[PDB]
Structure 1
Amino acid sequence: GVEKVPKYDIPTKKVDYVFIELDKMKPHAQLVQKELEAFIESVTGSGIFWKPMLLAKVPGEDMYLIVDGHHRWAGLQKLGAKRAPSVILDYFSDDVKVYTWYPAFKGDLNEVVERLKKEGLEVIEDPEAEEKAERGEIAFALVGEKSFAIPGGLEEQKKVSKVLDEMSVEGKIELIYYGLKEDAREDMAKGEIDYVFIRKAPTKEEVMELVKRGEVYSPKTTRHVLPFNPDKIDVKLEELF
């Protein structure tokens, strides 16, 4: 996924890592096979693991939510490793925020709507679609020249992400994930984007409940703004087995 995000000043802080067993970490997002593959190539290439996982302790369980690190986690498991260096966050601090991403596309709206309807969704023209999506009352608003409601909740949201990645792979559309919906509207005015998909961002509380149910979001659903990026670390791959 091509990304476009606000140039956020986030400070690097020197926080120590701790090794946490991979089987104590819970994903909140579906994996992206290419990102998994790129991590595997990179870590096996250097033999240094330099970027700690960011975790949050799951209330009432001997388990951690993966805040950042899904492909590191999954890649290390696929290689046979058993742990990863991790930074434990104060996740429910006001200092940690969660937003979402806004998938936007240049291409044919009609092929996209057909394919959405092919996976059991509907796409209803609706001038209040964006207001409804922002309140969490529908799955996605689809907004460009016309405004459309896509009814539902999580299952319908995952079909939308799934259809778009299929059509991206097929090269029937160009797909950019925007950090901010207004940057997708700043660029749409310029003529670079036709349409943007708008959902209500998940809350921290919802993220944690989802993993407690053993469920996951589509890729590019959560967008965490953290109080810091951990400084880089000096851990050998051989230490993780």
Structure 2
Amino acid sequence: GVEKVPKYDIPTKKVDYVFIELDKMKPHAQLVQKELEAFIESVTGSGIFWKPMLLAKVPGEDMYLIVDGHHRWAGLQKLGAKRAPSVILDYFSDDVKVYTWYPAFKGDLNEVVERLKKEGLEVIEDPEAEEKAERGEIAFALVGEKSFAIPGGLEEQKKVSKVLDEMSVEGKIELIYYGLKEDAREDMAKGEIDYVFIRKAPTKEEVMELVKRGEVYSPKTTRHVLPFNPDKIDVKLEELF
């Protein structure tokens, strides 16, 4: 997939799954095309669905927030499947923590910036872009050798994400999402990526608030972390219809 594997593997737990209908699931985020395609090819090719979705009950509604699993959800619906193996979490428990994923690329800075500016974004050279972005003052900081501020909020975050999605589909960049910006910096020094986009993470209150209004975030906005990762499950794709 598009995400960088964590440098430390947290403990696994054999939590088991329950089938939940895909049309009872509510997205809070947009999709990355390469992440969707990779899941569809993996599950159809292998015949096995091995990672349960993470869900939480939406307050006041007979629906579940997709905590983690937007591409599995979209991909399965696209394939015509009806349900997915799921884990129902207590969203406001202190055992659900939320951070973010940082978009990153190996590719030409100048072509990326040009495409961002063509979409109407401002990309302003700014040595304090990173800390502005961590404070939530700008949409993203574009940081590597150079440092740029991208002003705005959610709409600009969507615009940025869309440019990267398109450039990724066109083969002009390799698009990778990092859980930790320090991992991105380490890979920069190895030459494995050139630039990373820094953003402040949402809070759990903001996520549910946003979903209750029927809105979505830009892709990979939340990185939810539990005290464990569920163990691999062994569900046939045919069992999801």
TM above 0.5, one fold? Answer: yes
Report the CA distance between 1:2 and its aligned residue: 4.2
Change in 2 beyond 3 A, CA 1:138/1:73: same
Q: Is the 8 A contact 1:49 1:236 kept in 2?
A: yes
| C-alpha distance in structure 2 between counterparts of 1:107 and 1:234, whole Å | 37
| C-alpha RMSD over aligned residues | 2.5
Moved more, 37-46 or 151-160: 37-46
Q: 1:173 to 1:31 in 2, by over 3 A?
A: closer
Which deviates the most, 94-103 or 46-55? 46-55
Cα distance, 1:235 vs structure 2:
4.2
* Kept in 1: contact 2:4–2:176 (CA 8 A): yes
Point out where structure 1 has 5 or more consecutive residues left out of the alignment.
none
**Residues 181 and 198 in structure 1, CA contact (< 8 A), matched pair in contact too:** yes
Unaligned residue ranges in structure 2 (runs of 5+): none
Classify the secondary structure of the residue corresponding to 2:177: strand
Distance 1:188 1:35, change over 3 A: closer
Distance 1:156 1:235, change over 3 A: same
Distance 2:4 2:126 in 1: 27
Relative distance call for 1:108 and 1:207 in structure 2 (3 A) is: same
Q: 1:125-146 deviations in whole A, cap 9, x for unaligned?
A: 2222111111111100112233
Contact residue 33 and residue 169 of structure 2 kept, 8 A: no
Distance 1:212 1:236, change over 3 A: same
Change (3 A) 1:16 1:174: closer
For residues 112 and 191 of structure 2, what CA distance do their matches in structure 1 show? Answer: 19
Structure 1 residues 200-236: Cα deviation after superposition (integer angstroms, max 9, x where no partner): 1122222222222222223232222222222344545
Post-superposition Cα deviations, 1:32-54, rounded to whole Å, max 9, x if no partner, equal 44444444444455655443221
Alignment CA distance shift 1:49-1:2 (3 Å): closer
Tell me how far apart the structure 2 counterparts of residues 195 and 232 of structure 1 sit (CA, whole Å).
33
Q: Is the 2:34–2:168 contact (alpha carbons within 8 Å) kept by the matching residues of 1?
A: no
Is the Cα–Cα contact under 8 Å of residues 5 and 180 in structure 1 kept in the other structure?
no
Q: TM-score, normalised to structure 1's length?
A: 0.86
Q: Distance in 2 between matches of 1:214 and 1:101?
A: 22
Query: Which whole-Å CA distance do the structure 1 matches of 2:166 and 2:40 have between them?
Result: 24
Task: Report the Cα offset of residue 156 of structure 1.
Answer: 0.2
Deviation for aligned residue 1:121: 0.7
Question: How many residues are matched?
Answer: 241
Cα distance change, pair 83–98 in 1 and its aligned pair in 2 (3 A): same
Contact 1:10 1:226 in 2 (8 A): no
Q: Secondary structure at the match of 2:3?
A: strand
Deviations 1:97-145 (A, max 9, x none): 2221222334332222221111111011222211111111110011223
Instruction: Between 138-147 and 180-189, report the one with greater CA deviation.
Output: 180-189
Alignment of 1:87-106 (within 5 A): 87-106=87-106
Q: Identity of counterpart residues, as a percentage? A: 100
